[PDB]
Amino acid sequence: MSIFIGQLIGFAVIAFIIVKWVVPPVRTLMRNQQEAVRAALAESAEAAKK
Amino acid sequence: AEREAMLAKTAADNRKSAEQVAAAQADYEKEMAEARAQASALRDEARAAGRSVVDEK
């Protein structure tokens, strides 16, 4: 159990680290990329409409 | 490839939208000018006929 508890606490620490410092940037990148995809779709839309 | 094609389309089309607006304006102006020129030619022919009948009388 002691080994399990120790490695679980280590996993929790690394999970917190990634969620607080690695998740935010990657997430941005994903959102900014999505912005782009939607935007391009809509722009084709407007170009065709126009 | 699809995003690529969408990009192509948007670009070209917005280019052709501008081109077609310019073409509408330019063609309206050109056809109006042609109509005015034809009207001027008709009036010049009318004055020529008037002068010819004046000379004949």
Tally the helices of chain A: what do you get?
1
C-alpha end-to-end distance of chain A: 67 Å
Oligomer: part of a larger assembly
Which outline of chain A best applies? rod-shaped
Major sheet attributes of chain A: none
Question: Which structural class is indicated by helix and strand composition of chain B?
Answer: mainly alpha
Radius of gyration of chain B: 24 Å
Protein name (chain B): ATP synthase subunit b
Keywords (chain B): ATP synthesis, Cell membrane, CF(0), Hydrogen ion transport, Ion transport, Membrane, Transmembrane, Transmembrane helix, Transport
Subcellular location (chain B): Cell membrane
GO molecular function, one term (chain B): proton-transporting ATP synthase activity, rotational mechanism
Summarize the model shown.
Chain A has 50 residues and is mainly α. Chain A has one helix at 2-49.
Describe this protein's structure.
The structure is cut from a larger assembly and holds chains A (50 residues) and B (57 residues). Chain A is mainly alpha-helical. In chain A, 96% of the residues lie in helices and 0% in strands. Chain A contains one helix and no strands. Chain A has one helix spanning 2-49. The longest helix of chain A has 48 residues, at 2-49. Chain B contains one helix and no strands. The termini of chain B are far apart. Chain B has 57 residues and is mainly α. Chain B is rod-shaped, with a radius of gyration of 24 Å. The interface between A and B is small, with 9 and 9 residues. The PDB classes it as translocase/inhibitor. Keywords: ATP synthase, mycobacterial, inhibitor, tuberculosis, antibiotic, hydrolase, TRANSLOCASE-INHIBITOR complex.
For this entry, give a set of tags.
part of a larger assembly, 2 chains, A: 50 residues, mainly alpha, rod-shaped, B: 57 residues, ATP synthase subunit b (chain B), ATP synthase subunit b-delta (chain A), translocase/inhibitor
